[PDB]
Design a protein around this ligand. Structure first.
Ligand SMILES: *[C@@H]1O[C@H](CO)[C@@H](O[C@@H]2O[C@H](CO)[C@@H](O[C@@H]3O[C@H](CO)[C@@H](O)[C@H](O)[C@@H]3O)[C@H](O)[C@H]2NC(C)=O)[C@H](O)[C@H]1NC(C)=O
Ligand SMILES: *[C@@H]1O[C@H](CO)[C@@H](O)[C@H](O)[C@H]1NC(C)=O
Length: 593
């Protein structure tokens, strides 16, 4: 007879227990009386007098379980009651057991498609309803099925067709047949990610793609500014929702991780939703967590030398006593190369990995660290090995070494090595033959008009004796210069044997004489060495033939001069150790007129 009224509710039709709700009856015709019906029975009646208005209110303060049911509104003017508004289901939650909700495969879905969601609840004979948080409340009703293989009771829903214009947030409910108006508490907020058809977002991790465990990091998803909410997801499944993003400058979805654990590694992809619709997924960014398996640290060696010339073969050796599956090399803190299988060696009780690089390009100069990991956890790595640095020389002027503070040293003296060159190199490097450590320093500008590098070594010990080389390069240049001809550092006071010295001619010779001098030892000595106080030159090393049981060596001097004040001491050495000298000898001062 009259225009049918309209029924509105605030908030939405599904309300939790002990929460205030308000019905509104809407019309603009007349207001003689309003009637609220519950399940076809007169529940309440409101009269608009004793202040006249246009729309009626019904407050159900603190809703309980009995308030759930179908509600309708009617109104009367004069003496004519006008039909019924379309019914409205008021549902209340509680009393029951909370279900769980899972994506059977993944929430990723192509636009205009369907996804399968498994809801799980422990009630035997229950009907299940899957709903979405949207304007048009879409519902799905299914029965409980139990797979004999899985030995579990649960239902499945095919949601769709997933349109890219609407955001999809799914929630599951379970209810008894004979009590339909009372549902279970809502399950987890399961949101779907739609592979849209718009512009791709750029993804980054500013601390890096390889992070040691227990540390913090950030992930940025930037892109089209049509977006409102940003998401992150993994193939090893995660879902993270960021609705309010950093506005300056522009929509940049920031995600923060305070400490990396097992679940935080894997392949990440940013998804995006906006007013125009969903977007194509981002490129796959692999996040790696190291630090786990913090007991058996791997060890890294290099063959043949940590410094190689351009155009050679270089073998890196990553080994460990522990049964890892694969090893991976990292230049700087970034990736390089690829993974290789471990190899159980019978003799050395080791698990080995042999990384081949040939030829050696100047780009290989860097800081390599090898990690170990397993096949079933490709992103969970071991502890970084003690790093191995690599330098490559070849083409430029040789930077000769000053090698000051003498050529032979007794323990313990403070040794320094200065490295100079004609070309104004901005950076110098030092390395000992047969070693694994390399040293680098920035050159200072001297008064002469070129660059020199100051190198401070520690206490001269048994190990400091050997062969040393230096290299030079510019600030921008990645190619290093060929080394200088080798410096031989010698250590005395190491062998128990002690020689002595003599000369043949007179002490006060004229400046044109010849002077042969001799030092021998009754014990076995292979080579002998002559040393002068402050000898800037390399000392001469001579072979030993045994006259009697004593081992000796003559040092001849031809065309002597007064510039040579004299030769003072003699040392010994053997073929067993070419650079480790014996103790000092009796000094002998010479003079030349
Ligand atoms: C790097 O360290 C070296 C270490 O020798 C510095 O070399 C300096 O060289 C000059 C001469 O080339 C030395 O001067 C000397 O001073 C004494 C008196 O102190 C004098 O009797 C000598 O005739 C000579 O003039 C100087 O002592 C020496 N050491 C220092 C600390 O200056 C070099 O300057 C350092 N810096 C660079 C950029 O290489
Ligand atoms: C060249 O670059 C290195 C590395 O940043 C720096 O140590 C050095 O001060 C720079 N310039 C000079 C003149 O050494």
């Amino acid at each position: 007879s009259l225009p049918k009224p309209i029924l509105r509710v605030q908030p939405d039709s599904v309300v939790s227990r002990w929460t205030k709700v308000t019905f509104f009856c809407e019309e603009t015709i007349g207001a003689n009386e309003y009637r609220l019906y519950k399940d076809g029975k007169l529940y309440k009646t409101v009269t608009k007098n004793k202040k006249p208005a246009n729309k009626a209110e019904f407050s159900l303060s603190n809703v309980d379980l009995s308030n759930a049911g179908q509600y309708e509104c009617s109104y009367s003017t004069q003496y004519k009651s006008s039909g019924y508004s379309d019914p409205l289901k008021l549902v209340v939650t509680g009393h029951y057991w909370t279900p769980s909700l899972l994506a059977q495969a993944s929430p990723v879905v192509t636009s205009g498609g369907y996804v399968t969601l498994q809801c799980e609840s422990w009630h035997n004979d229950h009907k299940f309803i899957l709903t979405v948080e949207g304007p048009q409340k879409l519902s799905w009703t299914q029965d409980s099925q139990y797979n004999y293989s899985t030995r579990k009771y649960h239902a499945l829903f095919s949601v769709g067709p997933v349109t890219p214009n609407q955001r999809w947030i799914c929630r599951c409910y379970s209810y008894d047949r004979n009590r339909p108006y009372v549902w279970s508490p809502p399950s987890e907020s399961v949101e779907l990610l739609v592979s849209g058809n718009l512009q791709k977002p750029t993804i980054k991790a500013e601390p890096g793609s390889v992070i040691t465990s227990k540390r913090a990091m950030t992930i940025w998803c930037q892109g089209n500014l049509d977006a409102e909410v940003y998401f992150l997801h993994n193939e090893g499944s995660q879902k993270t929702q960021s609705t309010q993003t950093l506005q300056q400058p522009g929509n940049k979805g920031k995600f923060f991780i305070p400490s990396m654990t097992r679940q935080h590694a894997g392949q990440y992809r940013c998804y995006c939703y906006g007013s125009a619709g969903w977007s194509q997924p981002s490129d796959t960014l692999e996040l790696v967590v190291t630090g786990i398996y913090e007991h058996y640290k791997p060890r890294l060696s290099v063959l043949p030398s940590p410094v190689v010339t351009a155009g050679g073969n270089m073998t890196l050796h990553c080994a460990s006593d522990f049964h890892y599956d694969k090893f991976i090399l990292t230049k700087e803190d970034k990736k390089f190369g690829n993974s290789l299988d471990t190899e159980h060696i019978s003799s050395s009780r080791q698990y080995r990995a042999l990384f081949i690089i040939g030829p050696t390009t100047p780009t290989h100069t860097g800081t390599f660290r090898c990690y170990g990991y397993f096949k079933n956890a490709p992103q969970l790595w071991s502890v970084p090995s003690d790093l191995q640095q690599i330098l490559i020389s070849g083409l430029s002027k040789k930077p000769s070494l000053l090698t000051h503070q003498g050529h032979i040293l007794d323990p313990g003296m403070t040794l320094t090595l200065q490295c100079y060159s004609d070309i104004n190199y901005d950076r110098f490097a030092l390395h000992k033959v047969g070693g694994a450590d390399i040293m680098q320093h920035s050159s200072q500008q001297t008064d002469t008009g070129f660059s020199v590098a100051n190198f401070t070594l520690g206490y001269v010990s048994s190990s400091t004796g050997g062969q040393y080389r230096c290299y030079g390069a510019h600030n921008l240049s990645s190619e290093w210069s060929a080394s200088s001809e080798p410096l031989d550092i010698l250590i005395t006071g190491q062998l128990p044997l002690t020689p002595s010295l003599s000369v043949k001619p007179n002490h006060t010779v004229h400046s044109g004489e010849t002077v042969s001098l001799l030092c021998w030892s009754m014990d076995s000595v292979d080579t002998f060495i002559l040393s002068k106080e402050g000898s800037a030159q390399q000392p001469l090393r001579l072979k030993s033939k045994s006259h009697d049981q004593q081992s000796q060596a003559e040092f001849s001097m031809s065309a002597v001069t007064s510039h040579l004040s004299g030769t003072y001491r003699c040392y010994g050495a053997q073929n067993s150790s070419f650079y480790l000298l014996s103790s000092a000898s009796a000094p002998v001062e010479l003079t030349v007129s």
